[PDB]
Amino acid sequence: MKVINDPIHGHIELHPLLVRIIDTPQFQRLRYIKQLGGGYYVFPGASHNAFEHSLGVGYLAGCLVHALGEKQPELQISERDVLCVQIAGLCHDLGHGPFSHMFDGRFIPLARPEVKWTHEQGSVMMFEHLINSNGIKPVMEQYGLIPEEDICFIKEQIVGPLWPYKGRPENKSFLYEIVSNKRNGIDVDKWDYFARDCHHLGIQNNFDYKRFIKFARVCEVDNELRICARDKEVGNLYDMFHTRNSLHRRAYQHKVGNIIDTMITDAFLKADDYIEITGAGGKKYRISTAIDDMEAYTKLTDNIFLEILYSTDPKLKDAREILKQIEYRNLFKYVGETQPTGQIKIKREDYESLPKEVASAKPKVLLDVKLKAEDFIVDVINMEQLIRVYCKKVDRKSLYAARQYFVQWCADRNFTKPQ
Amino acid sequence: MKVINDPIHGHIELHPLLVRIIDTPQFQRLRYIKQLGGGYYVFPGASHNAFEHSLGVGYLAGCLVHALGEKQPELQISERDVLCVQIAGLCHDLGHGPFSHMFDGRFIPLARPEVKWTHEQGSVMMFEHLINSNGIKPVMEQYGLIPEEDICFIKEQIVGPLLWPYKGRPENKSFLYEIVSNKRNGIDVDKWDYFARDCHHLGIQNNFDYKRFIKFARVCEVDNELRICARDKEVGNLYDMFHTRNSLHRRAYQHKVGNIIDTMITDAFLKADDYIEITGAGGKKYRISTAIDDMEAYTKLTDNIFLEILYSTDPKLKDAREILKQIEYRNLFKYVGETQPTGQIKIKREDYESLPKEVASADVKLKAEDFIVDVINMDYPIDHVSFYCKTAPNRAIQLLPEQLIRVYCKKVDRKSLYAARQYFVQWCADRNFTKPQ
Amino acid sequence: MKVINDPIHGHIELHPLLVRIIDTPQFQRLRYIKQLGGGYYVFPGASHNAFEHSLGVGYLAGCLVHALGEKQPELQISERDVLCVQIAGLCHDLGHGPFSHMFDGRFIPLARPEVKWTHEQGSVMMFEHLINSNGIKPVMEQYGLIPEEDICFIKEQIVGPLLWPYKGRPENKSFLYEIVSNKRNGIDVDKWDYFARDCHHLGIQNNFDYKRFIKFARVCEVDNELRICARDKEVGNLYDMFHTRNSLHRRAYQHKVGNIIDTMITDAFLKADDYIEITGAGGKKYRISTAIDDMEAYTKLTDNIFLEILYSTDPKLKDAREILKQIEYRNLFKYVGETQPTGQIKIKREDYESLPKEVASAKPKVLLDVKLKAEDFIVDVINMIDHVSFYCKTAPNRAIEQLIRVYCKKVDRKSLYAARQYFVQWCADRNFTKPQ
Amino acid sequence: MKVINDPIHGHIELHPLLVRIIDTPQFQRLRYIKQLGGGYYVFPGASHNAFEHSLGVGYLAGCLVHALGEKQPELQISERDVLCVQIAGLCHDLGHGPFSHMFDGRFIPLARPEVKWTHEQGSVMMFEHLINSNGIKPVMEQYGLIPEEDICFIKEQIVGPLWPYKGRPENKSFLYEIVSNKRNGIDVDKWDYFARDCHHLGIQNNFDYKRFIKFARVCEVDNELRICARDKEVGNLYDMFHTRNSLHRRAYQHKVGNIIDTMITDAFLKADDYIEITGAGGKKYRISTAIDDMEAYTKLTDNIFLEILYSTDPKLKDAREILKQIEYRNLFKYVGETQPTGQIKIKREDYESLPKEVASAKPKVLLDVKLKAEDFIVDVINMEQLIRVYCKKVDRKSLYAARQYFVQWCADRNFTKPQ
Ligand SMILES: Nc1nc2c(ncn2[C@H]2C[C@H](O)[C@@H](COP(=O)(O)OP(=O)(O)OP(=O)(O)O)O2)c(=O)[nH]1
Ligand SMILES: Nc1nc2c(ncn2[C@H]2C[C@H](O)[C@@H](COP(=O)(O)OP(=O)(O)OP(=O)(O)O)O2)c(=O)[nH]1
Ligand SMILES: Nc1nc2c(ncn2[C@H]2C[C@H](O)[C@@H](COP(=O)(O)OP(=O)(O)OP(=O)(O)O)O2)c(=O)[nH]1
Ligand SMILES: Nc1nc2c(ncn2[C@H]2C[C@H](O)[C@@H](COP(=O)(O)OP(=O)(O)OP(=O)(O)O)O2)c(=O)[nH]1
Ligand SMILES: [Fe+3]
Ligand SMILES: [Fe+3]
Ligand SMILES: [Fe+3]
Ligand SMILES: [Fe+3]
């Protein structure tokens, strides 16, 4: 029973089966992926990686089921169920790529627009690659798990159904609300990284997650079983929501932070043709096509940033120069922000077209210089949706032009006007 | 005038000249060097890098000199003096290598026992390379610094004198040299930051309040010298600082697994030294062990070198790579025992390479290649701290808390370990070391 | 099991027996007695009363005894021992009168030099009156107390003994008498709370972390006896506590105007003592100064007696009312000087009344332009590391003034000058230090 | 220039003119009026009075106006303006009666439903009484004020117009926004008592009023000059609002605290008839009619609670027993809560009727007991409006009855159903 010190949760005790999963290359992989990606280039305290976060969510996942299990013995929550929820909590973010959400959120859409990719999909794949590669299934049975049934359960908690769930019966419906909760969005994943991002960012956390946990109970709501709170900690709920809004307003939506993630992304796009990651059977993969083979994906982390930066290969100069602009702090320039009214949602696959769309708008009054689409970055921020535009040219005569193309682009697409 | 948010110090304000120094390849480099080295492999929260620590030290150096200047205008502390103290604070750890203290503490001594090397030396070398490569001296003058002897001052604040031995400032401003790196108490803003910072990442309660000390600190005469002295009501705070220091060392820095992993990473670098090429100045190519000789190569040497080995396909690198994979699967070297050299003078860096052979020479037989000998130092003080009362303000005025030598074995079977245990016990006896309990 | 939110201690949980004691006239009385008395007329944040102080002392006493018991079961601390220690913390300041230390420190001495009175005594009389008035003893037994023995124990924790002088507990449990009121070192939970609390209302930084001290406290043997001892790393915390204590005393408790105002209020009470009637037990009627003789009357004696005077229409009370109106217009007595009785026998409470005659009777000559009677003087008498055992956790079970101020009622320049001379001369005649 | 130590604002420097105003019976009165009234009987840390709050507001009022003038000298802000803004902050709550809002919010409505009264009216009446009784007008001129013009100015800041303002021209309209601002309800009164109540109640305060003051600007908005904050301060505003909601939910709307405030009020109503307060010319007044003469009102503070509690007169027995109930903690019992629907308000003039309305409701399924109007307490809590009903009879057969009468009163009056 390894016990781990954590700056947020204090002591974390880990059941030997978890320890067994943790000590594999496919997991240790997470020590090398910053939680806030390029946020670190705005918040120096944000040095933390997915690894310690994943331990925390797995740890809280355990705490929540055992607390429910003790206060409501009728729910018939077993030894087996607890371990499976911890494992879902531990591996929920296994599928992350370099710089977290930058990777599945922007890069893969821009690099391979055909492809439907989510990091959850990856997490289920990585988890399979892990237990197969490290003979975890024998260990699973030693501690009372049924590989055929429980592995399905674990995967379902992560990605959803592949009554649509075959991993557990409908009477244990409340469990699927524990690691990842789609429709109210209150799950142990958020509790952990709210507290953790706050701790590293120096932002105040008003939410007390453990009082939330032992006032937590299972109740019947519309004849399907969900996790509910007793109502005088409604005061606690609003504190969580305020903590959420602050992290978004102060950190996740930060204007420089997001620019930098789009610069790291631009660098990656310029290096994809040239960088090789070795996957299974010696085959070589691109940064963008490593999602196709997990042996390669295991080797794809935040390190790819430095591999570009330190490279001498002349083929990599254009990428290397973009990363060097970040080091010297000559960043892309902020042009403006807009929103999609009314119900139009920009879809990931239309990301690649947008810089052409803006550049092709006819802004007249026309002025001295005309900008190609290569001069524009269009950034799509989702929770609402924000659309921000940055210009790569820093002439103030180009920057003026970029603003005109933009104000009219919003117009031609019926977006809010850039206040 | 940029302002940075810090989880430890809150908002940090930076002079434009500082931002200029910060926004260079030679400084941002520190974003890619872990502060606690292999500690990250025992304390998952210890994810922090040399970068945020250097900002903190720069900030604190600023806070203290500004505090002194405003309450004692007679000391003649200039705006020029403050900037030089901040810049010294900012760049003091520029010279660190992959995994900080691991690099100059164990790797360089084991790879090149020949060599003169401390990271403080490097910081100076790197500091020179930085201001030269990025045209800083014009910007220094632009803000009123005199490059030729202010740069000397900064370097002297970092590494010490290159009598009154300092050329950077006259003896009447001697107390400034106590701010960033103070060796005769070891009480300086560098320690303050990383006590506060390591605790925050490790979950150890820090009982020293550095902000209170800075608010009561004054310059007073002591033995014909000007020193920074503390108000006498801050003595309780000093005892807390020494216990926090003591907790950090017992609980984290001297962690047994933590150090084993430090020696495993080190063993891997050595097996990779012959084969890894780092591109330096003039296109010359360098090794991990020789990158310290040219700063243009050294800028490209960070923690990344770990993952370059870990991910490599080159068969030359299998030996180094297999050790790192061993760290990943958590098959670490096994702990055999601990001893101290007390009574006699302590082990020096230049004989580190010899220690495994010495152990092998004291059922199954083990050669030196399977032994790891690890030497843990605290520094390779309350009576050196001056107080002042408030009645005559420019006057100086049981219950408190080394070298450790540990040996690890690479063979993990139950009888190699037993033999290994006895090779150790006999090596301890033979060299007059304490007997392993 | 009631839980109360507190700005210093967070949530305070209260055992039902305590709640029964709290919810009585004799206890709720403490809501109407300011802790710092006239200090409030100098520190506007200091609005707090003895009631919240008492909850905290009760809460801390509990924390400490609970903490010790769980870490050293060999001490054999019962649930019953904990309740009695808590009840003692709760009722230790039950005996305070109007404006706290003002009442027993200056008013009763000036009014009845005759009489021996301390509020600790009163806390005991009031405590008896409480549990008898509200039928607490049946409730005590319901929760496992033995009233005759445990009430003696609680009383002894408050006022001290009424060889091993305590009847309430055996010497193997001696360390319990150190928690609420600690005789010779003055380190008790009473001080811990009011240091924290006074700091909090006054805006003075408190550097003592009482939560750390309680978490490392152990009972260890010292000189044949069991005493409460601290870990060796908490010596740093102790020095902070002693400084926080000295800062509170020098900045607030000894504040010059604050004290001048306490003596103005006292003067007013003295001028109103003859004419105010407090209805005691059995319709018997009492004065402010004699209400201490009956607890039923004393329950009705709080800070309110100030506004009763101030708001009065009665002409017998005009003399008193005017002094209190002076406080409102801030025409206060003027500070003339301060002195100390260094190496001299110190002034006793029985001699307080005489002192202003003594000062007016000094002949300061150089003779001055005006002569001042004794009624024109106020003379104020203000009274204020070895003691602590430490332990090594390798070896866990064994150890390792008076101020005299004078104020003049005539303001101031010719009165104030004259006053300084009478005073400097009084110091000489009395061998007190020369006024700075 | 007296300097005062304060737990919230630290050191407060006070101009001699202000010191001249404070040192009067009519101001010092506020030392005897609890800020959270009956709240103290639930939150023991809440021992603080109207006096320290008023100093605080006066201090903040000064800091804000001094700030605007030095960052925007075109605004023409004189020292004379600063002193008038300080005096308005200081005397804005001069008009409070026993237990603050309890007096004008509930007691005076129940005792004299016919009548005008608000404490803001009282503050102006008391301020006038203050300066006349203490020869304040000469000191005003000595430090440069024009009494006829400036006394009007101060009064308007407190109570509003008696362009509607006679005290200052519209080009200085922004000054009327500082002490009491009802357009947005964001004024320095609120900053103080938010911070102060947080400090005494032990509720965490997220608003930094200091950062707000040095980003505050005077700017033109829609024809008029109003006070605005930097766009980087929008996060701080949300913090102020969370701090506010936390206080309302956790303290000001506390169920027992509000119950006790109505018990005290009942105690006053039962004592009104027999207690005499001596006003000007020896004329005698009631607690409810002391608001008519400022000499009597000055001597009307929280002391009236203890005057009843300690009384022997048999006329006062019934009142005294209600207070003794508070001492023993035998309180009214909580029956239920409801809201009005429509944008309809219950008005102060109608408070007196509500207990009769509840008792006359025909609730049934008939009951074991019949309840009189005297057995009901109807409490109206304003921010929305909450309506609570308490019963003075504590047996469960009455308490059951009371609940039926209440739910039925809600029905025929179309309030929401009490859950
Ligand atoms: N220059 C620089 N700023 C950093 C760094 N690390 C964290 N920060 C902080 C400081 C800034 O508040 C924020 C980014 O500021 P920027 O310099 O990128 O843009 P900003 O608009 O604040 O300044 P500007 O007017 O464009 O020169 O992140 C760093 O390594 N270098
Ligand atoms: N296996 C593993 N341990 C970790 C990790 N991170 C932090 N730790 C902590 C947990 C323990 O407190 C400490 C010891 O881990 P070890 O694998 O070295 O276990 P240890 O040698 O103490 O016991 P064992 O060899 O299993 O009997 O390091 C991690 O990522 N993987
Ligand atoms: N005047 C006055 N001062 C107060 C009040 N409340 C708290 N304080 C503070 C301000 C001062 O720091 C101290 C009282 O000073 P005083 O005005 O009573 O006498 P002080 O000797 O400071 O000045 P003075 O003799 O008039 O020159 O307590 C108050 O209500 N009125
Ligand atoms: N009995 C009592 N409670 C107090 C006192 N002071 C503060 N409190 C706290 C305890 C509670 O959290 C809150 C109100 O408690 P109450 O006993 O008066 O009503 P509640 O319905 O919450 O409790 P109950 O149903 O009677 O057990 O105020 C006090 O002086 N006496
Ligand atoms: Fe996650
Ligand atoms: Fe350092
Ligand atoms: Fe006490
Ligand atoms: Fe107010």
- Cα separation, A228 vs A218, whole angstroms: 6
- Catalytic one among C53, C92, C119, C129? C119
The rounded distance, in Å, linking the Cα atoms of B436 and B57 is 40
The answer to whether the Cβ–Cβ distance between D250 and A238 falls below 8 Å is no
Closest partner residue to D242 (CB to CB) among A242, A249, A250 is A242
D242 contacts A249? CB cut-off 8 A: no
D85 CB under 6 A from ligand 3? no
Q: Are B87 and B21 in contact (CB under 8 A)?
A: yes
Ligand 3, atom nearest to C258 Cα: 28
B123: CATH: 1.10.3210.10
Q: In angstroms, what CA-CA distances link B138 with B15, B79, B151?
A: 15, 17, 13
Chain B closest CA to C212's CA: distance in Å? 10
From the candidates A48, A119, A129, A200, which is the catalytic residue? Answer: A119
**A2: CA distance to ligand 2 center in Å?**
6
Decide which of C331, C352, C374 is a domain's last residue: C331
CA distances from C125 to B328, C99, C119, C180 (A): 72, 19, 10, 18
CA nearest neighbour of C97 among C147, C32, C43? C32
Give the integer Cα–Cα distance in Å for A317 and A271: 9
d(CA B111, CA A38): 36
Domain around C98: 1-331
What is the Å distance from ligand 6's center to B50 Cα?
8
List the structure tokens of D140: 């005003």
- How far away is chain A from the Cα of D239, in angstroms, using its nearest Cα? 9
Helix (H, G, I), strand (E, B) or coil at C345: coil
Domain boundary among C331, C355, C370: C331
C429 and C391 fall within a common domain = yes
Q: What is chain D's percent helix, strand, coil content, to nearest 5?
A: 55, 10, 30
Tokens 């909580």 — which residue? Answer: D334
Token pair, residue C23, equals 């919810």
Contacts of D57 in chain C (CB under 8 A): none
Cross-strand partners of B10: B6
Which DSSP string corresponds to A245-306?
A: HHIIIIIIT-HHHHHHHHHHHHHHHTTTTT--EE-GGG-EE-TTTGGG-HHHHTT-STHHHH
Extended beta strands in D40-194, E state? none
Listed residue (B210, B194, B211) closest to B202, CA to CA? B194
Q: What is the rounded CA–CA span in Å between residue A138 and residue B66?
A: 64
SS3 for A340? Answer: coil
**To which H or E segment does residue A230 belong?**
none
For residue B236, cis peptide bond before it (omega within 30 degrees of 0) = no
β-sheet bridge partners, residue D402: none
DSSP 8-state symbol, A331: P
Say yes or no for a CB contact (<8 Å) between C10 and D328: no
Helix-strand-coil split of chain C, %, nearest 5: 50, 10, 35
Q: Would the CB of A22 count as within 6 Å of ligand 2?
A: yes
For residue C314, the chain D residue with the least C-alpha distance is D278
What SS3 class is residue B222?
Answer: strand
- Beta-bridge partner residues of A334: A390
* Conformation bin of residue D129: beta by default, left when phi > 0, alpha when psi is -120 to 50: alpha
Q: Which residues of A touch D (CB under 8 A)?
A: 204, 206, 235, 238-239, 242, 245-246, 249-250
C390 contacts in chain B (CB < 8 Å): 399
Beta strands in C161-207 (DSSP E): none
Q: Residue B106 has what DSSP assignment?
A: I
Give the CB-side neighbour count of residue C10, counting CA atoms within 13 A. 2
Site residues for ligand 1, CB cut-off 6 Å? A 41-42, 44, 256, 329, 331; B 2-4, 19, 22-23, 28
The reply to whether C270 and C398 lie within a common domain is no
Q: Order of strands, edge to edge, in the sheet holding A333-338? A: A333-338, A385-391, A376-382
CATH number of the domain to which D369 belongs: 3.30.70.2760
Closest residue by Cα to residue A306 from A320, A318, A326: A320
With a CB cutoff of 8 Å and minimum separation 6, the contacts of B73 are: none
Q: Which residues of C touch D23 (CB under 8 A)?
A: 328-330
* Domain shared by B274 and B396, yes or no: no
- DSSP symbol at C386: T
Please provide residue D129's backbone torsions phi and psi, each rounded to the nearest 5 degrees: -55, -40
Distance (Å, whole) CA C217 – CA C236: 14
Compute, in angstroms, the gap from residue A109 CA to the centroid of ligand 1.
28
User: Do residues A49 and B47 lie in contact, with contact meaning Cβ atoms separated by under 8 Å?
Assistant: yes
Q: Round to whole Å and give the CA distance between A69 and A84.
A: 14
**Are B311 and B201 in the same domain?**
yes
Task: Give Cα separations from A53 to A1, A15, A258, B222 (angstroms).
Answer: 19, 17, 22, 51
Closest Cβ opposite residue B236 in set C212, C232, C237: C237
Find the closest chain C residue to B205 by CA distance.
Answer: C212
Contact in structure between A376 and A389 (CB atoms under 8 Å)? yes
Strand partners, B14: B2
Domain count, chain C: 2
Spatial contact of A244 and A184, defined as CB atoms under 8 Å apart: no
Token representation of residue A77: 């929550």
Measure the CA–CA gap between B433 and B431, rounded to whole angstroms: 6
- Quick one: B356 and B312 in the same domain? no
Question: Probe ligand 3: pick from D1, D2, D49, D53, max atoms within 8 Å of CB?
Answer: D2
- CA D53–ligand 8 middle distance (angstroms): 6
Structure tokens at B272: 């990779």
Chains in touch with A (≥3 Cβ pairs < 8 A):
B, D
Output the CA–CA distances (angstroms, integers) from residue A304 to A317, C53, D346, in the order listed: 15, 61, 67
Chains A and C touching, counted as 3 or more CB pairs less than 8 Å apart: no
Q: Are residues B254 and B336 in the same domain?
A: no
Run of H or E residues at D67:
helix D50-71
Question: Which of B296, B316, B331 is the last residue in one of the domains?
Answer: B331
Tally Cβ neighbours within 10 Å of residue B161.
Answer: 12
The D-side interface with C (CB below 8 A) comprises 4-8, 10, 23-25, 28, 31-32, 40, 43-45, 47-49, 51-52, 55, 199-202, 278, 299, 301, 303, 306-307, 310, 312, 324, 327-329
Q: What whole-number distance in Å separates Cα of residue D395 and Cα of residue D407?
A: 19
Residues contacting residue A202 through CB under 8 Å, at least 6 positions apart: A45, B5, B6, B7, B8, B10
Where does residue D76 fall: left (phi above 0), alpha (psi -120 to 50 degrees), or beta otherwise? left
- Asked whether residue D160 falls in the same domain as residue D186, the answer is yes
> Considering only CB atoms, which chain A residues are within 8 Å of D238?
242, 245-246, 249
Instruction: State the Cα–Cα distance between residues C305 and D112, nearest whole angstrom.
Output: 30
Tokens of A71: 């206060």
| Minimum CA distance residue for ligand 2 atom 30 | B41
C410 CA to centre of own chain: 31
Cβ of C304 within 8 Å of Cβ of D310? The answer is yes
> C303 and C369 share a domain?
no
**String of DSSP letters for A123-135:** HHHHHHHHHHHTT
DSSP symbol at B413: S
State whether B195 and B325 are in the same domain. yes
Structure tokens at D141: 């001129």
Is the domain of A293 the same as that of A342?
A: no
Q: Which residues of D are catalytic?
A: 119
The residue with tokens 């910072």 is B197
Instruction: Choose which residue among A2, A11, A49 to substitute to test ligand 2 binding: the one with the highest number of ligand atoms within 8 A of its C-beta.
Output: A2
C-alpha dihedral (C363, C368, C374, C375), degrees to nearest 10: 180
- Residues of chain B neighbouring A306 (CB-CB closer than 8 A): 32, 302, 304
Residue A276 near residue A286 (C-beta atoms within 8 A) = yes
Q: Buried b vs exposed e over B39-56: b needs ≥16 C-beta within 10 Å?
A: bbbbbbbbbbbbbbbbbb
Q: Is the beta carbon of A13 within 6 A of some atom in ligand 2?
A: no
H or E element: which one contains A101?
helix A101-102
Residue A286, strand partner residues: none
Q: How many CA atoms lie within 13 A of D82 on its CB side?
A: 21
The answer to whether C362 and C422 are in contact (CB under 8 A) is: yes
How far is Cα B172 from Cα B81, in angstroms, rounded to an integer?
13
The sign one gets for the Cα dihedral A220, A224, A226, A229 is negative
Tokens of A363: 């802004």
Which is the catalytic residue, given B96, B119, B129, B201? Answer: B119
Q: What is the DSSP string of B331-347?
A: -PPEEEEEE---SSPPP
Task: For residue B250, count other CB atoms closer than 10 A to its CB.
Answer: 11
| C277 and C396 belong to one structural domain | no
Strands B225-231 and C285-286: unpaired
Long-range contacts of range A163-170, CB-CB < 8 Å, 24 or more positions apart?
A: A168/A81, A170/A224
Phi/psi at D203 (nearest 5 deg)?
Answer: -120, 140
C-beta separation of B278 from B301 below 8 A? yes
Across the interface, which of C23, C31, C330 has its CB nearest the CB of D328? C23
DSSP string, D256-311: HHHHHHHHHHHHHHTTTTT--EE-GGG-EE-TTTGGG-HHHHHT-STHHHHHHHT-
User: What does the alpha-carbon distance between residue A64 and residue C289 come to, in Å, rounded to a whole number?
Assistant: 62
- Tell me which residue of B267, B420, B270 sits closest to B334, measured CA to CA: B420
Does the beta carbon of D2 sit less than 6 angstroms from any atom of ligand 3?
yes
Distance CA D13, CA D10 (A): 10
C365: helix, strand or coil = coil
**What is the spatial distance between Cα B15 and Cα B82, in angstroms, rounded to a whole number?**
11
Alpha-carbon distance C92 to B287, whole Å?
75
Which among C86, C94, C166 is positioned nearest to C128, based on CA atoms?
Answer: C94
C169: DSSP letter: S
Contacts 24+ apart (CB under 8 A), D8-15: D8/C45, D8/C203, D8/D56, D8/D192, D8/D195, D8/D196, D8/D199, D9/D56, D9/D59, D9/D60, D9/D192, D10/C203, D12/D55, D12/D56, D12/D59, D14/D55, D14/D58, D14/D59, D15/D83, D15/D86, D15/D143
C198 and C294 inside one domain: yes
Please tell me what resolution, in angstroms, this structure has. 3.0
